[PDB]
């Protein structure tokens, strides 16, 4: 089973986050993710890394996936409470959304949120749905904004201590997908 990265570099974090337009080209999903291990109210372990898959790949391929896979070793600790936030550079299909659903009905220790840049096949009625499922688990899903996309710059990029820049329209952008996601959810 795959590890981790532990970084991008610059170029491909302007490029694979992105927050549009319509984002044909990205057939890539990218995901960062910070783990955050407490027990008895003190931090106990801090883990970041990304994983990457391509749009083309088995389900079973898909970043989230692999972060599943990954996290299920040791990496978890049954005494302990675990925080996972995940960066999507896309919104997760309908099957991960499931294997989430399960992964966190099987380790009650975990809480999950997930912050995304852009809304995956979202005129359709099952990338919905998933999105639905996750919030139903209590998953947290937004939509990243100027301090997330700050955020993943600050600890997921070879950023050459360079600060972010945003994009033209990366706030206008934003407050559409966060529209389109909070109509959907309720
Ligand atoms: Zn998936």
Redo the contacts with the bound molecule.
């Keep these: 089973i795959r590890n981790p990265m532990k970084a991008m570099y610059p170029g491909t974090f302007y490029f694979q986050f992105k927050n549009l337009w319509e984002a044909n080209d990205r057939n890539e999903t990218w995901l960062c993710f910070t783990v955050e291990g407490i027990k008895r109210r003190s931090v106990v372990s801090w883990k970041t890394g990304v994983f990457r898959n391509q749009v083309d790949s088995e389900?079973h391929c898909?970043a989230?996936?692999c972060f599943l896979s990954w996290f299920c070793d040791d990496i978890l600790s049954p005494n302990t409470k675990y925080q996972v936030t995940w960066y999507t550079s896309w919104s997760?299909?309908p099957?991960?959304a499931g294997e989430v659903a399960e992964f966190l009905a099987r380790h009650s220790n975990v809480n999950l949120t997930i912050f995304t840049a852009r809304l995956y096949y979202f005129q359709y009625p099952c990338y919905q749905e998933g999105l639905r499922s996750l919030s139903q688990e209590g998953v947290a899903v937004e939509i990243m904004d100027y301090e997330d996309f700050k955020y993943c710059w600050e600890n997921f990029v070879y950023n050459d201590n360079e600060p972010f820049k945003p994009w033209k329209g990366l706030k206008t952008n934003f407050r559409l997908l966060k529209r389109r996601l909070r109509e959907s959810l309720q």
Excluded: A, S, V
Aim: glycine share 0%; proline share 12%.
């Design positions: 389900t898909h989230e996936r997760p299909c099957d991960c």
